[PDB]
Amino acid sequence: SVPSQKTYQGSYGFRLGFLHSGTAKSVTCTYSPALNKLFCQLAKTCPVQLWVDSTPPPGTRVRAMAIYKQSQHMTEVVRRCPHHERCSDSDGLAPPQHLIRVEGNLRAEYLDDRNTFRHSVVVPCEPPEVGSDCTTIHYNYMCYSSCMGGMNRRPILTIITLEDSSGNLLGRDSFEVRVCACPGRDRRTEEENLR
Ligand SMILES: O=C(O)c1cc(I)c(-n2cccc2)c(I)c1O
Ligand SMILES: [Zn+2]
């Protein structure tokens, strides 16, 4: 009924990392460590780093899935709103209903779960480029948090899972997401509210 959100580094020491983009009104994606919350604009690039202590086996994959954060909504499938699922902004791979896309990876696969009806997007693990210490996946979020008939101002979490070739759990991390017009201002506002 509800995917686990328990942080689990597992055998390979799996965890996420985020850039330090600041909170200028012009910023398009910015992460708050104090809130564990990513703020981003609609359909803009969200770089998410993958870090490990040791190399996972060939065939390991990384999956992203959104769930509602509030318990009274957690059994509801997170999907694009009635407007955005029909706006024909397909990239040729992502189903138009899916909130989360992976950008610039032809090996991305999109799953509609046959039992839970939840959406996810999964990519193969690839080693860092020479000179880099981590691998970065570029995600896009294809609806605003405020979209009527969709997320409708309800907070969501993105759950990132490291999986073996059969889909068994190897590692898990997560972060809250707000998709909004002004991520810099909203991050500043929410961090102030927390303080
Ligand atoms: O240093 C390595 O050998 C390495 C290998 C892999 I495969 C990955 N990875 C884990 C998830 C996606 C890529 C990473 I992050 C690494 O640092
Ligand atoms: Zn929408």
Swiss-Prot record:
Impact after mutating residue 115 to K: In a sporadic cancer; somatic mutation
Impact noted for substituting residue 47 to F: In sporadic cancers; somatic mutation; requires 2 nucleotide substitutions
Effect of residue 137 to F: In sporadic cancers; somatic mutation
Outcome, altering residue 163 to D: In sporadic cancers; somatic mutation
Outcome recorded upon mutating residue 176 to Q: In sporadic cancers; somatic mutation
Effect ascribed to mutating residue 81 to Y: In sporadic cancers; somatic mutation
Result of altering residue 24 to T: In a sporadic cancer; somatic mutation
Region of interest (Required for interaction with ZNF385A), residue spans: 5-195
Result of altering residue 150 to S: In LFS; germline mutation and in sporadic cancers; somatic mutation
Result, substituting residue 79 to M: In sporadic cancers; somatic mutation
Outcome recorded upon mutating residue 175 to L: In sporadic cancers; somatic mutation
Effect recorded for residue 115 to I: In a sporadic cancer; somatic mutation
Listed result of changing residue 31 to G: In a sporadic cancer; somatic mutation; requires 2 nucleotide substitutions
Effect of substituting residue 141 to F: In a sporadic cancer; somatic mutation
UniProt effect for mutating residue 70 to H: In a sporadic cancer; somatic mutation
Mutagenesis or variant effect for residue 67 to T: In sporadic cancers; somatic mutation
Effect of residue 56 to T: In LFS; germline mutation and in sporadic cancers; somatic mutation
Record note on what altering residue 60 to P does: In sporadic cancers; somatic mutation; does not induce SNAI1 degradation
Effect of residue 91 to H: In sporadic cancers; somatic mutation
Consequence the record notes for mutating residue 183 to F: In sporadic cancers; somatic mutation; requires 2 nucleotide substitutions
Effect of residue 52 to A: In sporadic cancers; somatic mutation
Impact upon substituting residue 71 to P: In sporadic cancers; somatic mutation
Stated name of the protein: Cellular tumor antigen p53
Naturally occurring in which organism (per UniProt): Homo sapiens (Human)
Gene, per the UniProt record: TP53
